[PDB]
Every structure is written in structure tokens, then in C-alpha cells.
Design a protein around this motif. Structure first.
Motif, PDB file in Angstrom:
ATOM      1  N   UNK F   1      40.049  82.131 -26.908  1.00  0.00           N
ATOM      2  CA  UNK F   1      38.833  82.697 -26.336  1.00  0.00           C
ATOM      3  C   UNK F   1      38.201  81.742 -25.328  1.00  0.00           C
ATOM      4  N   UNK F   2      38.194  82.151 -24.062  1.00  0.00           N
ATOM      5  CA  UNK F   2      37.609  81.361 -22.993  1.00  0.00           C
ATOM      6  C   UNK F   2      36.102  81.608 -22.914  1.00  0.00           C
ATOM      7  N   UNK F   3      35.458  80.990 -21.920  1.00  0.00           N
ATOM      8  CA  UNK F   3      34.020  81.171 -21.740  1.00  0.00           C
ATOM      9  C   UNK F   3      33.673  82.631 -21.481  1.00  0.00           C
ATOM     10  N   UNK F   4      34.461  83.307 -20.641  1.00  0.00           N
ATOM     11  CA  UNK F   4      34.207  84.717 -20.361  1.00  0.00           C
ATOM     12  C   UNK F   4      34.324  85.561 -21.624  1.00  0.00           C
ATOM     13  N   UNK F   5      35.324  85.273 -22.462  1.00  0.00           N
ATOM     14  CA  UNK F   5      35.521  86.050 -23.682  1.00  0.00           C
ATOM     15  C   UNK F   5      34.329  85.912 -24.625  1.00  0.00           C
ATOM     16  N   UNK F   6      33.862  84.678 -24.840  1.00  0.00           N
ATOM     17  CA  UNK F   6      32.719  84.478 -25.726  1.00  0.00           C
ATOM     18  C   UNK F   6      31.449  85.072 -25.131  1.00  0.00           C
ATOM     19  N   UNK F   7      31.269  84.955 -23.811  1.00  0.00           N
ATOM     20  CA  UNK F   7      30.112  85.571 -23.173  1.00  0.00           C
ATOM     21  C   UNK F   7      30.115  87.079 -23.383  1.00  0.00           C
ATOM     22  N   UNK F   8      31.273  87.715 -23.196  1.00  0.00           N
ATOM     23  CA  UNK F   8      31.351  89.165 -23.327  1.00  0.00           C
ATOM     24  C   UNK F   8      31.177  89.608 -24.775  1.00  0.00           C
ATOM     25  N   UNK F   9      31.728  88.854 -25.730  1.00  0.00           N
ATOM     26  CA  UNK F   9      31.564  89.239 -27.129  1.00  0.00           C
ATOM     27  C   UNK F   9      30.112  89.064 -27.565  1.00  0.00           C
ATOM     28  N   UNK F  10      29.440  88.018 -27.071  1.00  0.00           N
ATOM     29  CA  UNK F  10      28.020  87.839 -27.367  1.00  0.00           C
ATOM     30  C   UNK F  10      27.202  88.963 -26.739  1.00  0.00           C
ATOM     31  N   UNK F  11      27.552  89.354 -25.511  1.00  0.00           N
ATOM     32  CA  UNK F  11      26.861  90.454 -24.846  1.00  0.00           C
ATOM     33  C   UNK F  11      27.029  91.746 -25.635  1.00  0.00           C
ATOM     34  N   UNK F  12      28.251  92.028 -26.092  1.00  0.00           N
ATOM     35  CA  UNK F  12      28.485  93.230 -26.885  1.00  0.00           C
ATOM     36  C   UNK F  12      27.703  93.187 -28.191  1.00  0.00           C
ATOM     37  N   UNK F  13      27.691  92.031 -28.859  1.00  0.00           N
ATOM     38  CA  UNK F  13      26.963  91.909 -30.118  1.00  0.00           C
ATOM     39  C   UNK F  13      25.472  92.148 -29.917  1.00  0.00           C
ATOM     40  N   UNK F  14      24.884  91.533 -28.890  1.00  0.00           N
ATOM     41  CA  UNK F  14      23.448  91.687 -28.679  1.00  0.00           C
ATOM     42  C   UNK F  14      23.116  93.109 -28.235  1.00  0.00           C
ATOM     43  N   UNK F  15      23.974  93.721 -27.413  1.00  0.00           N
ATOM     44  CA  UNK F  15      23.686  95.068 -26.929  1.00  0.00           C
ATOM     45  C   UNK F  15      23.790  96.078 -28.067  1.00  0.00           C
ATOM     46  N   UNK F  16      24.743  95.880 -28.985  1.00  0.00           N
ATOM     47  CA  UNK F  16      24.829  96.792 -30.121  1.00  0.00           C
ATOM     48  C   UNK F  16      23.735  96.511 -31.143  1.00  0.00           C
ATOM     49  N   UNK F  17      23.256  95.263 -31.218  1.00  0.00           N
ATOM     50  CA  UNK F  17      22.127  94.959 -32.090  1.00  0.00           C
ATOM     51  C   UNK F  17      20.845  95.590 -31.566  1.00  0.00           C
ATOM     52  N   UNK F  18      20.715  95.697 -30.242  1.00  0.00           N
ATOM     53  CA  UNK F  18      19.532  96.315 -29.655  1.00  0.00           C
ATOM     54  C   UNK F  18      19.384  97.787 -30.019  1.00  0.00           C
ATOM     55  N   UNK F  19      20.446  98.446 -30.489  1.00  0.00           N
ATOM     56  CA  UNK F  19      20.368  99.851 -30.870  1.00  0.00           C
ATOM     57  C   UNK F  19      20.581 100.067 -32.364  1.00  0.00           C
ATOM     58  N   UNK F  20      21.711  99.619 -32.919  1.00  0.00           N
ATOM     59  CA  UNK F  20      21.991  99.926 -34.319  1.00  0.00           C
ATOM     60  C   UNK F  20      21.199  99.041 -35.274  1.00  0.00           C
ATOM     61  N   UNK F  21      20.759  97.865 -34.823  1.00  0.00           N
ATOM     62  CA  UNK F  21      19.963  96.984 -35.666  1.00  0.00           C
ATOM     63  C   UNK F  21      18.468  97.116 -35.417  1.00  0.00           C
ATOM     64  N   UNK F  22      18.066  97.723 -34.298  1.00  0.00           N
ATOM     65  CA  UNK F  22      16.652  98.015 -34.087  1.00  0.00           C
ATOM     66  C   UNK F  22      16.148  99.022 -35.112  1.00  0.00           C
ATOM     67  N   UNK F  23      16.964 100.025 -35.429  1.00  0.00           N
ATOM     68  CA  UNK F  23      16.620 101.038 -36.424  1.00  0.00           C
ATOM     69  C   UNK F  23      16.691 100.407 -37.808  1.00  0.00           C
ATOM     70  N   UNK F  24      15.526 100.127 -38.396  1.00  0.00           N
ATOM     71  CA  UNK F  24      15.493  99.638 -39.770  1.00  0.00           C
ATOM     72  C   UNK F  24      16.039 100.687 -40.733  1.00  0.00           C
ATOM     73  N   UNK F  25      15.560 101.929 -40.610  1.00  0.00           N
ATOM     74  CA  UNK F  25      16.121 103.043 -41.365  1.00  0.00           C
ATOM     75  C   UNK F  25      16.204 104.313 -40.523  1.00  0.00           C
ATOM     76  N   UNK F  26      16.090 104.193 -39.198  1.00  0.00           N
ATOM     77  CA  UNK F  26      16.244 105.302 -38.254  1.00  0.00           C
ATOM     78  C   UNK F  26      15.243 106.424 -38.552  1.00  0.00           C
ATOM     79  N   UNK F  27      13.968 106.075 -38.400  1.00  0.00           N
ATOM     80  CA  UNK F  27      12.889 107.030 -38.585  1.00  0.00           C
ATOM     81  C   UNK F  27      12.709 107.895 -37.338  1.00  0.00           C
ATOM     82  N   UNK F  28      11.869 108.926 -37.475  1.00  0.00           N
ATOM     83  CA  UNK F  28      11.546 109.809 -36.359  1.00  0.00           C
ATOM     84  C   UNK F  28      10.376 109.290 -35.534  1.00  0.00           C
ATOM     85  N   UNK F  29       9.757 108.179 -35.944  1.00  0.00           N
ATOM     86  CA  UNK F  29       8.607 107.654 -35.213  1.00  0.00           C
ATOM     87  C   UNK F  29       9.006 107.202 -33.814  1.00  0.00           C
ATOM     88  N   UNK F  30      10.199 106.629 -33.663  1.00  0.00           N
ATOM     89  CA  UNK F  30      10.629 106.165 -32.360  1.00  0.00           C
ATOM     90  C   UNK F  30       9.855 104.952 -31.888  1.00  0.00           C
TER      91      UNK F  30
END
Lengths: 52, 37, 132, 41, 75, 224, 59, 74, 74, 74, 74, 75, 74, 74, 74, 74
Positions: F1-30
Motif C-alpha cells: 500500500x503506497x501513499x495514494x492507496x492509504x489516502x484513498x482508503x482513508x477517504x473511503x472510510x471517512x466518506x462512508x462514516x459521514x453517512x452510515x455512522x452519522x445515523x445513530x439509529x436512522x431516525x426520521x428527524x434528519x
């Protein structure tokens, strides 16, 4: 240094962001928060008044 | 919580995928040619 | 059509209605338009100024009190004016000068009236210019 | 040069990211939209 | 002998920019002529003569520098 | 894993955390981050409606959305003092532009075939000017093929290089000089200014990319 | 001049422009028509249910 | 010899910059033409010949610049 | 031969500036197009082809400049 | 050879001057688009696409300049 | 390593000359934006986005010039 | 190394031209704001930050050119 | 060091082109100021200070080039 | 002092160009002055000192460029 | 002083580029004069002396450029 | 004697740029003249002599540039 001054200025940039952009975004989000909650409650109130 | 919904990924987005495959193939072909090393 | 027809009307007595006429000066907010004949349709707000109307007879000056210089593709120049300047019998120096200097003191009385007194003095000065 | 480490890998990355997005995240927004529409109507 | 001819060519090349203003000006005269004709269809018989006169005047203004470049080249 | 690989995997992790981990229990409040994602979705969907709409905007909305989020997450990690501009080659944006242009051309040749050549003659331009028009429009499309990459990539690299050169040339900010007053602190002010400029430029050029690819898709699907 | 912001509207501007000549008129031109135009006896009397009918102020 | 050709090429380069004026001028001509024809649709037939003539003259000036550049080169 | 190719490159660099005025010209024609169309929607069908021709060959002037630069190079 | 590469770099630098015209051109295009939307907001949907087209053409002129510079470099 | 570096810096300057067009371009875009919101306050939400679009595009052109300069610096 | 520093100075001097665009841009923004506020006084509160941002971006481009000149000088 | 000082003077000479922007900047600022005060005298009290500030910023942009040229003079 | 004085002369010649911007400043200031005074004669009395100050400030930049050129000559 | 004289000549040639500003500026002043007289005829006498003074002030820049060119030459 | 003659040629060539501003000024003066004549047909008598005077004053710069180029050459 070739890169440390950027680290020094990052704190100031974050401070200015929190001072100016953060309250604006907070108010913008909370306004539609209240709007959505109120319109949802109003729709539910209309439905329960119709059923009444 | 999280569920899989089957939106069209190939019926509608085929040209982009085939363009990416062609670009990758061209890059692989030109790696030993367009490098001058 | 041949030439130009001008429809000059006044609330007391209308002056012209579909009469053959050559170039007529139409002082607008920007400037006067010497419409020879035909001309593209236009709509311009007229400003107090000299409306000089040529026919085959002579060149008579008509200091206008305002209106619109509106034209139509059928070459209809309907100038809806209010008061004209028949020849030069309307000329009188003293009353215009005294009215101007008497409206200068009330030029700053009350908002709308204060603003309009300045325009009244301006059209009085235009009358002075037309006095000759 | 050092090209066979980020270009094809980047293509695999945006392919899998597009798949994950379109199959997971857009449906949540669509679901909340249609739910708000239904309980509002 | 080579340097003087080289500088003559350089001077002609730098003089050729003189026609840029001549072209822009001839065309802006034509543009104002078109605008005037459109805003007054009956004024064409008046605007056309001085419009052509201004065209020729700007053309001569540009041709002055063009002839200067020509005499730099062949003289 | 080069610098680009780790950068991209970190980007994917943070971007998926911004959606699937933002929802504590996925309420309708939004919630506020949920409503931010909702606003972004609505904005991209109305790019799609406004610029490619009329029969098939919805079908092509998802790539607009995904490219917008990818560029957004790339531009967000650009101003951090350590942040490396995705291995600092930026040829990835050029590759994206080339592949998108190729896909648009393939779509045009599929849905129109030989009629795609009629796009070079929109309304008039009769036979004496037809070859000139077709040459001009072909060259314009060739320029479009490189427009998108040499744009976001160029601006990101220029911002990073300005960052580096600015930081290098003020190394004597309060090292040994005696004139390090607010006059010597003015360079810090310009560095702060270019922080704000880089942020705003990244966001607005992500919007630029979205609207440009929408316009290209409209030109491909709809002939005018 | 400023007959919209400082002033009121085009109507009063044109009316006063005409009235400047009307008042500054020669005796030969001073006839019944211009005298009738000069005289103004309209009083602004707004409605009650519409504008409370405060008073009949001059127009 | 080689210096003469070098300055010949540089003169051709500084002569090619003459076409900027032709481009901007034909721009302003067609711009005023479009504005005028948009104002009154009945004037287009009358204004087209004069507009295209002025355009042709501007292009003739540009072609004069290009011909000077060419006679420099060739 | 060094100086010949060097000044060929210099003249090519100076020659490609012709796209500056080509872009400015297409932009000015287009700006008046937008102004007239927004001031008169009904003139679209009869203004569009003329404007297309105009900015197309206005950019073709820059294409001529590019061709001059190319022949300076090749 | 050193002078050849030096003039390559000089010509690449000169090739970028024409890009400012492309920038001001796209800018005046969008300026006229702003003015047109101001005059006729309802014509925005019809007017934006060929506004993008004009931006594309002017940016294409800038990109011809950029590619000329790039080939002058490498 | 003397003339090549010298002409490298010179070409970097001749490429940075182009940011003038980008500056005047973002200027005229914001200027027409101001005029448009002036004529109609209510069109602000519609004329803001394409205006910042034009600003971004012109700034990207200026950064194209800056990139051409920078490859002639590092 | 004399030629290298000489061309560094030349490049910085010619790179300073970007302040021409910076000034022309900030002043174009100011002129438009003046026209807008004069046409309607009420819109000033909503059009002032717009012109401030435009001026900031134009002077930012000017600062970019100035910094290019500075790095050509001292780097 | 003879060529060093020579090109330093050359750079100082070319560094003064930035004053052109300040000049046309005060030009357009005062032109718009005069047009605006011609629109209505009331807006003068609120429009004059920003015109003064804009001239100050334009002259500061010019003084940037002036100071850089002075650094290339002493 | 051959090369040094030569470059001094070249730099003075290049510095002499600020007068063009100074002249455009004075000119458009006076042009706006004429337009305003023609639009409303009353506003002339107020605008005239504004025009005096504007052209004086614009000519200050030309004077600065003239001094910069002068110090390059003596 | 042979190369010094050559640089004097080239510097005078460069400095002769200041008359563009004076010419187009006094022409812009005269164009505003024409627009003003076309709009307001009664203001022609009042705008005579102010516009003539503005013409003289604008041509002062060209006079300064001529003086600089003569100093470079003689 | 050769290099100074070369510099004479180069300076005389550069001195001919003045025709740019001269022609653009004459033409914009005539443009304002024709616009005023079309909009105000009753302005010809009072606009023609002043248009001629403005043209002569604008051509003063062009003829001055021509004369200085001629004297530099001869």
C-alpha cells in the motif's frame, strides 16, 4: 520551516471558520430543522383533525 | 439499517465503464511504449 | 405611407390629428428625436423642451409641457401633450422670473412639494430659454 | 513510470464508490423523501 | 548585412500590430452604423456616406503603418 | 500500500462514516449532518433536472452525485498542513475527464449514430461553411475532453504549490529578524487569505465540474 | 429631476410642469379653460372602512 | 543567413498577432448587428449587406496581416 | 540550425496568441446575442444561425493563427 | 541545443498570453448572461445551454493556447 | 544550466502575464452580477450561482497560467 | 550565475504585471457597486458583501502575481 | 555583475506596467461615481466614501508594483 | 557601463508606458463628467471638483511613472 | 557608446508607445462630447471649455512621452 | 555601424504602434458621431465641425508617430 508555518496558520483558519461560517451553517440547518418538524406536525394535525 | 437496492449499474452506465476499460487497456499498452525509460 | 402624420392633443383644445408633417423635434429625457418619416416604433418620456414642427408653411416653435413620443410601424406619431407654445404670444419674462424666485424659497418646504418646486423652477428656466 | 499503482487502482476505487453510493446512500434519501411525502399526504 | 535585414524583418513584424487598431476601428464604425440604422430606419441615406468616409479614413490610418512596414521590408 | 492507496482508503472510510455512522439509529428527524446530506442530494438532483432534464435526468443523476461527493472529499483534504494532493500527480483528474468524454461520445454514437455528426450544424451554416463548422466543433469537443482534468487538477496542484512556496519563503518569520511586527505578520495574513481562497475555489469548482458534466450529458442526449 | 424618490410620481411631476406654464400665462391666453385648470378644489377624503377617513385633506 | 531566417520567423510570429484586431472587430460588427436585428425584426434585410461588407473589410485587413506574415515566411 | 529552430519556437509561441482575440470575439458576439435574445425572445430563430456563423468563423481566425503556429513548428 | 530549449521555454511562456483573452471572454459571456437573466428571468432555461456552449468555445481557444505551450515544452 | 534556467524564469513571467485576464474576468462577472441584482433584487438567488461559476472558471484560467509558470519554476 | 539572477529579476519584473489585472478588477467591481447602489439605495445591504468578495478575489489574484514575482526574486 | 544590474534595471522598467491597472482603475471608479451622482444627488453621501476607498485600493495595487520596482532599483 | 546604461535606457522606455493608463484615466473621468453635466446641468457644479480631484489623482500615477523613468536616465 | 546609442534608439521606440493613451483618450473625450451635445443641446457651450481642458490634460501624457523619447534620443 | 542601424530599424518599427490608438480613436469618435446623428437627426450642423476637430486631434498622435518613425529611419 518549509511546512510548519502552514501548521501555525491552520489554527487561525479553523478559528476564523468557526467564527464566521460555522454560526451561519448552524442557523441555516436549524431553520429547516424547525421548518421540517413544524410542517410534519402540521400535516399530522390536519390528518387527525380530518379523522376527528 | 443498511440494505441493498438494485439500481441499474450496467443497463445505463455501460458507456462510462467501457470507456474506463479502454483507457486502462491503452495505459497498459503504452506503459512499455510511452514512457521513454 | 408618404411623409409623417402627427397627432398632437391638448386637454383644452386638440391641436393636430393625422396631419401630414415633416421632421418634428421631440425633446425626451435624453434628447430630442427629429423623426423625419416612418421610423422604428419608439416610446420615450418627453421632457419640457422645444417641439419644433415643420410643415410646408413655416417652422413654428411649440415649447411642450411634457408627454410621450410614441411611434408605431404604421408611422403614427401620437404626442399626448398638455400645454403648447402658440407662436410667441405666450412669452412673458416677468411672471416666469417672479414665479421662479418665489418658488425658490419654498423649494425646501415639505418633501414632495420641496422636490417638485425645483422641477417647477427648472421648467420655468426652460420657459426663460424659449422666451428668446 | 510509477503509474500502475494509482490509475487502475483509482478506477477500481471510483467504480466501487459509485456502486456503494448508488446502491446504499441515495436510497436512504429517497426513502426519507417518500416517507415524508406519504405521512404528509 | 545579415543583422540589418534581420532587424528589418523584426521591425516589420512589430509594425504589423498597427493594423490591429485599424481593423477594430473600422469594425466599430460599422457596428455603430448598424446600430444607428436599426434605431432609425429612415436615417440610412444620411449615415451611410460619413460611415464609408470614416471607414476609408481608418483604412488610410492603418495603411500608413502598413506602408511603413512595407518600406521596412523592401527598402 | 503506497501513499495514494492509504489516502484513498482513508477517504473511503471517512466518506462512508459521514453517512452510515452519522445515523445513530436512522431516525426520521434528519439531523444537522443528515439535513446537510439531504440538501446536497437536493442540489445535485436539481442540477440534473435543470441541465439534463426533460425525459431522462433521473437516470443520469447518480453519476453527477457520486462525482460531486468524490470531488468534495478530495477538495476537503487539500488544506490540512500535511494533506498531500492524492500523491500530488493530479493525472487522476485528467483520466476522469478523458473517460467521461469517451463515455459521452459512446453514448452519442449509440443513441444517435451518424446523427451525432449533425450536432456540428445546429441551426444554419450552409454547405460553404459546413467543413469549417464541423472542424471548429470537433476541436471544441477535443478541448472539452481535456477541460475537466486540466481544471480541478490544475487548481488543486497550484494551490498546493502556492502553499509550499509561501511556507518556504517565510521561514524567517520570527527566527532571527528584528522587524517581526505586524508588518512581518502580514505574510501570515496572506497565508490565511489563500486558505480561504483555496477552500472556496475547491467548492465552487466542484460545482463547476458538476454543471459542466451535466451540460455535456445534455449535449450528448439532446441534439440542438 | 428627483420626482420619484424625493418627489412622488410622474403624475404630480407632469401636473406641476403644466401648472408652471398655466400660472405663467399671458393675459390674452388667460381664458376660462386655463382658469378652470388652475383652480383645484378636490379634497383627499379617504374611506372609513378602507383608510379610517381621517380628514378631508387637500389632494 | 540563419539569423536572417530566425528574425524572419520572429517577425512572422509578431505579425500573426495582427489577427486579434480582426477577430475583435468582426465581433463588434456582428454584435451590433445582432442587437439591431433584435431591436426591430424589419431592419435585418436592410442591415445585412452593410454588416457583411464591414465584416469582409475587417477580414481583408486580417488577411493583409496574414499575407505580410506569409511573405515574411515565404 | 540551433537559432533557426529556436526562433521557430519563439514565433510559434508569439503566433498562438491569436486565440485571445478569437475567444474575445466569439464572446462579444455571444454577449450581444444574449442581450438581444433576452430583450426579444421572438428573434431567436432568425438570429441564431447568423450568430453561429459569426462566432464560428471568428474562432476560425484563431484556427488560422494556430495553423500559422503549426507551420512555424512543423 | 541549450538555446533551442531556452527558446522552447520562451515560446511556451508567450503561448500563455492568449489565455487571458479566453478568460475575459468567458467572463463577458457570463456577464451578458447575468444581464439577460436580469432582463428576462423566464428565458434562463432556454439561454443557459448555449451560454455553456460559448464558455466551451472560449475555453477551447484557451486550451489550444495551453496545448501549444505544452507541446512547446514536451 | 545557465541559459536554460534564465529562459525558464523568463517564460514563467511571460506565462504569469496572463492572470490579468482572469482578474478582469472575475471582475466583470461580479460587476454584471451587481448590476443584475441592482435592476431586480429578486433575481439574486438565480444570478449568484452562475456568477460564482464564471468567477471559478476565470480563476481556473488564471491558475492554468500559474501552472504554466510553475512547471517553469519547479 | 550572473545570467540566472539577471533573468530572475527580469521574470519578476514582468510577472508584477498581474497587479494591472488586480487593480482593473477591483475597480470594475467598485464601479459596478457604485452604479448599483446609486440606481437603488435599498439594495446596498445585500450588494456590499458581493463587491467585497469580488474585490478580495481580484486582489488575491494580484497577490498571487506579486508572490510569483517575490519567489522569482528571492528563490 | 554588470548583466545583473542591467536586467535589474530592465525588470524595474517593466515592473511599472502594474501602474496601468491603477490608472484605468481610478478611471472606471470615478466614471461610475460621476454616473451614479448623475442618477441622483442623494446617493452621493453614501457612494463617495466607497469610491474613495476603491481608489485607495487601486493605488495600493499600483504601489505594490512601485515598491517591487524600487526593490529592483536599490 | 555599456550594458548597464543600455538597460537603463530600455527600462526608461518601458516605464514610459504608464502615461497611457494615466491618459485613459483622465479621459474617461472627463467623459463621465461630460455625460453627467449633459444629463443634468445642476449636477455639474458638484461634479466639477470631483472631476478635478479624479484627474489629479490619476495624473499622480503618471507622474510616479515619469519619475521612475527619470531616475533611470540620470 | 555604439551599443549605448542603439539602446537609446530602441528605448525611444519603446517610449513612443505612450501616444496610444493620449489619442484614444482625447477621442473618448470627444465621443462623450458628441453624446452630450446629441442629448442636451443647451449644454454645448458649457461643455466646450471643460472638455477642451480635459483634452489638453489627456494630451499632456503624450507630451510627457514625447519629452522622454527626445531625452532618450537627444 | 550595422548594429545601430539594426536598432534604428527595430525602434522605428516599434514606434508605429501609435496607429493602433490613432485609428481606434478616430473610429470611436466617428461611432459616437453616427450614433448621435441617427438618434438626433437635427444635430448634424453642430456635431460635424466638432467631429472633424476631434478626428484631427486624434490623428495628431498618429501623424506624430509616423513622423518620429520617419526621422528615426532617416
Amino acid at each position: 520551516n518549509d511546512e510548519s508555518i502552514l501548521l501555525l496558520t491552520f489554527l487561525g483558519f479553523t478559528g476564523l471558520v468557526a467564527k464566521y461560517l460555522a454560526p451561519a451553517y448552524k442557523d441555516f440547518a436549524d431553520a429547516r430543522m424547525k421548518k421540517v418538524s413544524d410542517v410534519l406536525n402540521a400535516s399530522r394535525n390536519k390528518h387527525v383533525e380530518a379523522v376527528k | 439499517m443498511l440494505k441493498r437496492f438494485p439500481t441499474p449499474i450496467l443497463k445505463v452506465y455501460w458507456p462510462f465503464f467501457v470507456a474506463g476499460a479502454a483507457v486502462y487497456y491503452g495505459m497498459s499498452k503504452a506503459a512499455d511504449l510511452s514512457s521513454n525509460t | 405611407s408618404s411623409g409623417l402624420k402627427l397627432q398632437f392633443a391638448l386637454p383644452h383644445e386638440t391641436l393636430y390629428s393625422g396631419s401630414e408633417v415633416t421632421q418634428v423635434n421631440l425633446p425626451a429625457k435624453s434628447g430630442r428625436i427629429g423623426v423625419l418619416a416612418n421610423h422604428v416604433p419608439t416610446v420615450e418620456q418627453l421632457l419640457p423642451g422645444v417641439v419644433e414642427v415643420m410643415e410646408g408653411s413655416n417652422s413654428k416653435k411649440f415649447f411642450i409641457s411634457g408627454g410621450f413620443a410614441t411611434v408605431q410601424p404604421d408611422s403614427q406619431l401620437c404626442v399626448t401633450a398638455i400645454e403648447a407654445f402658440p407662436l410667441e404670444s405666450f412669452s412673458q419674462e416677468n411672471i416666469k422670473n417672479l414665479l421662479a424666485e418665489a418658488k425658490k424659497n419654498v423649494s425646501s418646504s415639505d418633501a414632495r412639494e420641496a422636490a417638485e418646486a425645483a422641477i417647477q423652477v427648472e421648467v420655468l428656466e426652460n420657459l426663460q430659454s424659449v422666451l428668446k | 513510470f510509477y503509474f500502475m499503482n494509482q490509475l487502475t487502482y483509482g478506477f477500481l476505487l471510483m467504480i466501487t464508490l459509485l456502486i456503494l453510493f448508488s446502491q446504499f446512500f441515495l436510497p436512504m434519501i429517497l426513502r426519507l423523501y417518500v416517507s415524508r411525502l406519504f405521512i404528509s399526504k | 548585412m545579415q543583422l540589418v535585414l534581420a532587424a528589418k524583418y523584426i521591425g516589420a513584424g512589430i509594425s504589423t500590430i498597427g493594423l490591429l487598431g485599424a481593423g477594430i476601428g473600422i469594425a466599430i464604425v460599422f457596428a455603430a452604423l448598424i446600430n444607428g440604422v436599426s434605431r432609425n430606419p429612415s436615417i440610412k441615406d444620411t449615415v451611410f456616406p460619413m460611415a464609408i468616409l470614416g471607414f476609408a479614413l481608418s483604412e488610410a490610418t492603418g495603411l500608413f503603418c502598413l506602408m511603413v512596414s512595407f518600406l521596412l521590408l523592401f527598402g | 500500500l503506497t501513499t495514494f492507496s492509504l489516502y484513498t482508503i482513508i477517504v473511503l472510510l471517512v466518506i462512508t462514516s459521514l453517512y452510515t455512522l452519522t445515523n445513530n439509529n436512522n431516525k426520521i428527524i434528519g439531523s444537522r449532518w443528515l439535513i446537510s446530506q439531504e440538501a446536497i442530494y437536493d442540489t445535485i438532483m436539481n442540477m440534473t433536472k435543470g441541465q439534463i432534464g426533460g425525459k431522462n435526468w433521473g437516470l443520469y443523476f447518480p453519476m453527477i452525485f457520486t462525482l460531486f461527493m468524490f470531488i468534495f472529499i478530495a477538495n476537503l483534504i487539500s488544506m490540512i498542513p500535511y494533506s498531500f494532493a492524492l500523491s500530488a500527480h493530479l493525472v487522476f483528474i485528467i483520466s476522469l475527464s478523458i473517460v467521461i468524454w469517451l463515455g459521452n461520445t459512446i453514448l452519442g454514437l449509440y443513441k444517435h449514430g451518424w446523427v451525432f455528426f449533425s450536432l456540428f450544424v445546429p441551426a444554419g451554416t450552409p454547405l460553404p461553411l459546413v467543413p469549417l463548422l464541423v472542424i471548429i466543433e470537433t476541436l471544441s469537443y477535443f478541448a472539452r475532453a481535456i477541460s475537466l482534468g486540466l481544471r480541478l487538477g490544475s487548481n488543486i496542484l497550484a494551490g498546493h504549490l502556492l502553499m509550499v512556496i509561501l511556507a518556504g519563503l517565510t521561514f524567517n518569520f520570527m527566527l532571527i529578524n528584528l522587524f517581526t511586527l505586524v508588518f512581518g505578520f502580514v505574510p501570515l495574513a496572506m497565508i490565511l487569505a489563500i486558505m480561504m481562497l483555496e477552500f472556496a475555489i475547491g467548492i465552487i469548482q466542484g460545482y463547476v465540474w458538476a454543471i459542466l458534466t451535466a451540460s455535456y450529458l445534455k449535449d450528448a442526449v439532446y441534439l440542438h | 429631476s428627483a420626482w420619484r424618490k424625493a418627489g412622488i410620481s410622474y403624475a404630480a411631476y407632469l401636473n406641476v410642469a403644466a401648472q408652471a406654464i398655466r400660472s405663467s400665462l399671458k393675459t390674452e391666453l388667460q381664458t376660462a379653460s386655463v382658469l378652470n385648470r388652475s383652480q383645484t378644489d378636490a379634497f383627499y377624503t379617504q374611506y372609513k372602512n378602507g383608510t379610517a377617513a381621517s380628514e378631508p385633506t387637500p389632494i
